Design a protein around this ligand. Sequence first.
Ligand SMILES: *[C@@H]1O[C@H](CO)[C@@H](O[C@@H]2O[C@H](CO)[C@@H](O[C@@H]3O[C@H](CO)[C@@H](O)[C@H](O[C@H]4O[C@H](CO)[C@@H](O)[C@H](O)[C@@H]4O[C@H]4O[C@H](CO)[C@@H](O)[C@H](O)[C@@H]4O)[C@@H]3O)[C@H](O)[C@H]2NC(C)=O)[C@H](O)[C@H]1NC(C)=O
Lengths: 96, 261, 96, 48, 1396
Amino acid sequence: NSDERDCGRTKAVCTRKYNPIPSVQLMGNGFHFLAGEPRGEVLDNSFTGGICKTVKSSRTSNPYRVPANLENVGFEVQTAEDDLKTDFYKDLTSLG
Amino acid sequence: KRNNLRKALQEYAAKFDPCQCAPCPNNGRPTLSGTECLCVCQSGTYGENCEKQSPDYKSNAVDGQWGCWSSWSTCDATYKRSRTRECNNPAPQRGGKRCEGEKRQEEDCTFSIMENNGQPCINDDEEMKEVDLPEIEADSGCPQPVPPENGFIRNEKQLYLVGEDVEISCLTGFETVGYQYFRCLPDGTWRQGDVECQRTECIKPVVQEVLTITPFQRLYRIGESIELTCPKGFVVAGPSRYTCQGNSWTPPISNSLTCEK
Amino acid sequence: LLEPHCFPLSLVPTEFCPSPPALKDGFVQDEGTMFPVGKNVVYTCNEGYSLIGNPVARCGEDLRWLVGEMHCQKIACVLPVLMDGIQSHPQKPFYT
Amino acid sequence: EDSERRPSCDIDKPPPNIELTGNGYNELTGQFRNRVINTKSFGGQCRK
Amino acid sequence: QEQTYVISAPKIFRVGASENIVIQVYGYTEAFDATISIKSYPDKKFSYSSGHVHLSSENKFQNSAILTIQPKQLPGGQNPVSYVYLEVVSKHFSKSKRMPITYDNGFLFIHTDKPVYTPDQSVKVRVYSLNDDLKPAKRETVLTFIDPEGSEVDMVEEIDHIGIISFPDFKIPSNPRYGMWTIKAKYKEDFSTTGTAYFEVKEYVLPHFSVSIEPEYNFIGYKNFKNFEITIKARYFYNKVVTEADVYITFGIREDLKDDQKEMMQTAMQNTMLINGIAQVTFDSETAVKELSYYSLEDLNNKYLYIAVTVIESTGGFSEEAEIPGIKYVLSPYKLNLVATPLFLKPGIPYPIKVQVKDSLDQLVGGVPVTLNAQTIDVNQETSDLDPSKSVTRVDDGVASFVLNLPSGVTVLEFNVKTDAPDLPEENQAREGYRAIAYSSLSQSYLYIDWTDNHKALLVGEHLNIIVTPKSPYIDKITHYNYLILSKGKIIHFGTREKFSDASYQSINIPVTQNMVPSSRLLVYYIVTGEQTAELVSDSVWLNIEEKCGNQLQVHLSPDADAYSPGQTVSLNMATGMDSWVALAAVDSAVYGVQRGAKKPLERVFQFLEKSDLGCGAGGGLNNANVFHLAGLTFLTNANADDSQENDEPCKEILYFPESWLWEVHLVPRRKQLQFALPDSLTTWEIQGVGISNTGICVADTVKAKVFKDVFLEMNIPYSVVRGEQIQLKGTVYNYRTSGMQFCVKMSAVEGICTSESPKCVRQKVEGSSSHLVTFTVLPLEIGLHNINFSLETWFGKEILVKTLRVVPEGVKRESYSGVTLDPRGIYGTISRRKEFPYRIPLDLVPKTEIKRILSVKGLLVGEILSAVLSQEGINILTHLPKGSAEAELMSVVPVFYVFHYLETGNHWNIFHSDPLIEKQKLKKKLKEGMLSIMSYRNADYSYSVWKGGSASTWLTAFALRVLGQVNKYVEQNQNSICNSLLWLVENYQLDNGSFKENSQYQPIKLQGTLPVEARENSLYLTAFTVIGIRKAFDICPLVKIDTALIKADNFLLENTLPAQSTFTLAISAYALSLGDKTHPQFRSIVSALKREALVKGNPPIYRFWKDNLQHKDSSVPNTGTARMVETTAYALLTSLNLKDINYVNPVIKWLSEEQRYGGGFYSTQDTINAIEGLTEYSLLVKQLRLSMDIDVSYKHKGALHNYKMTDKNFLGRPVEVLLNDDLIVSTGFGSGLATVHVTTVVHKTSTSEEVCSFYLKIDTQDIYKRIVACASYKPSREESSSGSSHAVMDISLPTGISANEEDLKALVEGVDQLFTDYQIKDGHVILQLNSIPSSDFLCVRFRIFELFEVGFLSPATFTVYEYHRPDKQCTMFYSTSNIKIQKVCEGAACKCVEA
Ligand SMILES: *[C@@H]1O[C@H](CO)[C@@H](O[C@@H]2O[C@H](CO)[C@@H](O[C@@H]3O[C@H](CO)[C@@H](O)[C@H](O[C@H]4O[C@H](CO)[C@@H](O)[C@H](O)[C@@H]4O[C@H]4O[C@H](CO)[C@@H](O)[C@H](O)[C@@H]4O)[C@@H]3O)[C@H](O)[C@H]2NC(C)=O)[C@H](O)[C@H]1NC(C)=O
């Protein structure tokens, strides 16, 4: 808060409350290539940069806010892999 | 700190790269935690470390994975070192992939010339300054004076102390008459020595891309002479021979003896 | 070495020099029953004498005093070499 | 003083069992053990 | 926290001081031990001092250790140790802390035998030299003379045996700069300890009598602008008031206390008679201001009045003179400040407040009322406001004082103070405001010292009795408080003070012992516990102590008398309370009358001795840390504080006829008596005795002894006289008999000082208690020093004045300088180690005069030298990366030649553990193999190439030539092969309008050569590199054809480097050209351009790089852009080193010497080579400049004159008089380094017989108050007509108190036949400005004069002029208003005289 320790009429913040993008801090964790896993927060994806850039997930959603570390974001649902494999075996024997 | 973190990343990689694991069964990628290997499984393989297969696992018995670097081979005739990896961890079997990425590395053989005295602090932007603001002059000395015509200052400070002194000097054509030192007084003034450079020598003038001149000497003493010349078979402009006049000769330098060679 | 008070301690010394040497017309400016390893002592001349050379002496780990080859000069002028064999009427061995 | 106090952060609520992450562990009994790390030192920062 | 400790120590440790360190422990009930110790920093390797101390109930768990850093046990080096560790170890605890240290130990009181000296005198000086423990120091001391122009002039050393150090009697150099020379003194040991004093060289006669001007206030303001009142008073130096003197006052407008030349009221020149010692003077400042100033209203000034006075003994001939320059006009005089006032509060204890007031050119104003206002704050920003109060300043002590009593919870105070007097328009009445705060204890536990902080001193040895009250929530646990008494820097006493059953404590009952005497400081402290927490609580107070010595040295003349008599033998008695040394000096009180407002030479010795207090202010503090810090202490404690949170401020909270003799030092064995003659001087002798012994310094009360007789002559003989001018010597016979008498006076003189009187006086009468003017007229015919004897031959015995006159020549002093640097190595161009200064004699010389010469030497020291070295990793440079194809052999061998030149030139062997002789020989063999190897790349054409089947390479040909050039300085190869290879290059590849193109090699070598200046103009890289090979080889094959080829190739390289191609081009080309004529014009231009390209870090440049291509990337592995840097920098470095200037080089060597862009460049040959060449050529320049030079000076035909042994131990030589009439040879042996030597020539030159005069001068004084006519004419060159002179400034000087008829002078301005444009009076001279001067005839101009005669002796007036359009054309003649009667003239250098 030290940028706001004592102030007069503060500059205009973005008007409504907006939530951040879903899971946005995973975009700012560091990854450990030899262990194959995330390890620690490296980029601050709660930082807003003094700006109001925003993304609409759907006409149905409220707008999300974009943290200043991100150059582009988008919500286009895709199915990059889909695999269904199934096999059946049936045997019937009758002896008289 | 950046550079040290590069160096550390390399040492960390050499120490903890998953290549040194025994190969993970059923095509799993090895991963290494600093203490143990764990197998990242292919889709359709399961168990603790990829041991067992789904009933749909056709392309069973297919294999292939890369292995650890051989420690640097000593330098070649272009002072480059190299290391290689054999792709034998295991080698590709029954139609499995080729190993990805380069199998050899080539690196210059640079080494440390000067004595270690601990790392300096360097910060990305700071080095920039070519020319900069004046310091306060709070020492109350004298800044570097303006030397006289054809002048020079034998040793250069920013600012000289109170009572300090400076020797002027004459460019190669000339010699000092009068007292060739100035001295800093208690207020920033300089006690300018009564001095003037007197000519004794002269120098080959600037000339065009065809010589138009014969360069007999480095310096010419006053009362000697220099000659404009044509390489072959013509005459154009300027005196054939000229002698020096306490000033320079008033030589032809806008154009010289640019003859039809 | 780093955390000495964390352990049983011999704050009392267990190695000492022999007693410091004398000077002609001078003495050690401090005195004791014993002189531990690493201890400094300092020499001063008796009244009317001046100690030329560095006054300082240390009991080394060799169990012997490092010293500066110090010399107690008497505080009197000697007659200089006579400038031309001239009569120096109040002739004396020393001039106060 | 009421003028010297300020809101350190918008909100005062930790993740839902963060205290269990600062417990000790016994390797031989496999049980968790009592509080070793202070998991709620906010360090004067509003880390949401 | 039930067990706790404090250790307390000085804020700074002084090296070589016996620092006393207290320990206190708390919460312990069994005894133990600790080792307080001083250790080296950072490393803790070396214990400098350690003490071992026992803590027990019997010691009340308090102790101290005495610890020191011996000056020689510090590691020394180029930059001195600034920090040390104080450690404690004990059972239960250890800790350590960084303590600053200082080399300021003890005091150097320079004492000089006079405040003033003349030319042809010398300056007996000594240094009282005492430790921090105030005992005699016994450290060798150097003392240094600084000219008024700040240039140092000598150094001198002596050893200290006694605490008194008597230096050789420095003679003032044969033509000095007048003004305030400075003596600085330092120990030539591991101490800083500068002392300083001043003395003025001036051309003076001691004053006959004192004059004082004494104002009612040091400013003029509302109270007095109407009129101001000032007292003029006078005494003879035989302590008798002046009987009757005419007195002339003068008043001037002055704009600045620094200086000006501003003007004055020409009316209001108030005149009066001083009678029976005094005249009263009043200035109606309004009247003269409104009538004559620019100013008409008081509001117009916050500027200065200057008042000046001439006193003239009315029948006594002597005149003396004074001023109070800078009596300020001010509209808000009374500036205020606190004294002795802590700005820290307590409840219940009164809060005394004291203020002073000052004038401009201050004194404590002392006669003024002042008023105080206060507001107080306690609980939750609750407020209560006090009644206004008034006080008056004490007329002597300057303070005005107030005391306040305060609510029991007062938490802050603010107060204002304003002046309160009748003359105050309150918006222009001065005021100040202040704030004060409680002790801010987090535990609300306090310790209030009950004392009243008094400015009045405690007497030595008396019992001080201070109450201290520990108010606290936790008084059950405060069984005692502890105290420390601090004097100068040191804890001198310490103790403990127990709780009585009445819940009150032992007071601080201490004798104020002798170690306290300038001042002392009391600090008091305790640690207390809560249930678990603990707090260190403290308070501190300043104590003024009586200024009494331990030696108690006392002096008297034992024949106790009102007055003594001329030539009298007298006995002086020294008594002392202990065995002591003593030093004596005697001065004529008239000496202190020359330097206006001069001190006693050892004035306020106890003040300077007080500056060693490490604390500041009167006491108190914002918290425990602030209390100890302001007390000058620091502490280690576990009880929750550390003064590390605080840092200093430059604090300002405040609390025969000799001139001198008896300059002697004696042992006084408790009593001593000396016997000596008082001199013929009829003046008070002030005898000052300075005692030195183990108790410290003392200055005895100055004994005054009058020398007096009922009748005597005194004579105003002036300080110097123009040869051939005739002057009035004047004086007076004094008669202090009750009777009158008849008297005579007669003058005896040598042949060279002739007179009209033809030697018998009037035998004139005089009254009792009276005096009569004496007048004698002489022409000093010959220069030098001469006796003149004036004798009284009258009743009450024979009186003879044995007196001497100085005589100097009739012409303007012109000074001509000469000098050379002495350079035995040709650092700055050619070697030059001898010079032969001409015995020239100009034309204009004053006929019989002697020309004078003075010579002195300045050693130009190196400055800071920065360490840069190859490691034992140097083995890897030598044992290079392998032999192999395309001459990876070549790349392996070139490193060997460079590393060998580095190891050789720096003597760097013993980098190994090996024997240096073995390694040198072992390496040499490897170098020889390299020679055969590099030869193996040669063609029989004497070309070189990278393959045997490879075509010719100019690049490798140049490179091989460069490298073999390097080796032949040390190990040889055959000149023929080199010469052939040079000639091969110079035949086959020398071009014109360019040079040395390269034969299109299969490849540029993959890690050799360099990235070219590729795309075009790579000719600049090639020419530079090829020239670099040739310039390194030419010394081993000098050939006219090769030389001719450089005469082309250098010139082409100059003529094409100019348009600023990428900087690596400019750098290699600059380096190449720097081997050439370093003083050719365009080379300096190219060098300058290279300098502009630089890059730097730091406020001044700490590092300096260069970059050519701005490849911005990082490189932890040094990609080839790294090479472009390391190589372009090395070329710039080597350019700079070729110009020989460590000051430019130093930040570059820092840059080379570090990781930076890592490794040996890209590990090319070319970068790595040039980088090692950098360290090599730098280590050369370092030794090249190093001063060791035995400069030997002899005349040419005549003998030796001196031998200055210039060294790194002493850089400076005193001027030697060049006495003899011969050419002077300065010379030196080879030695090392560079110096410079100066000779100044002084001569006196005539006006008429010289080229300085265009406008030839005459003047005549005639009775027909008097009138004066000047007559003068111009002189053209032989080729020019009588057009007349240019515009000129003409000066008519007049004797002081003579004045011209200005309203007659106006006719020279108002007349229709105009000549002069304007006139002014300035410095008492008349100036008039003249458009042109006739050469056809003497222009004659007449004026009239009136005399307010001002002086007994009058200097000759100049009639003088210079051409304003030609200001070097200066002409002068000397004249006076008085009639002349000593006259004869001859056709020779010296002449007779006759009486008119
Ligand atoms: C200004 O006043 C001062 C006052 O001091 C004058 O100074 C005095 O001047 C006189 C004369 O020069 C000088 O007198 C000599 O004093 C000596 C004592 O030191 C006497 O011994 C000496 O007598 C000898 O010389 C006489 C001739 O001058 C002889 O007549 C006599 O017999 C002596 O001769 C013997 O001794 C001398 C050596 O002195 C030797 O060479 C002979 O062969 C022989 O053996 C004089 O009385 C005073 O000394 C000076 N002042 C003093 C006493 O200090 C000064 O002269 C006046 N100057 C002027 C011109 O104004």
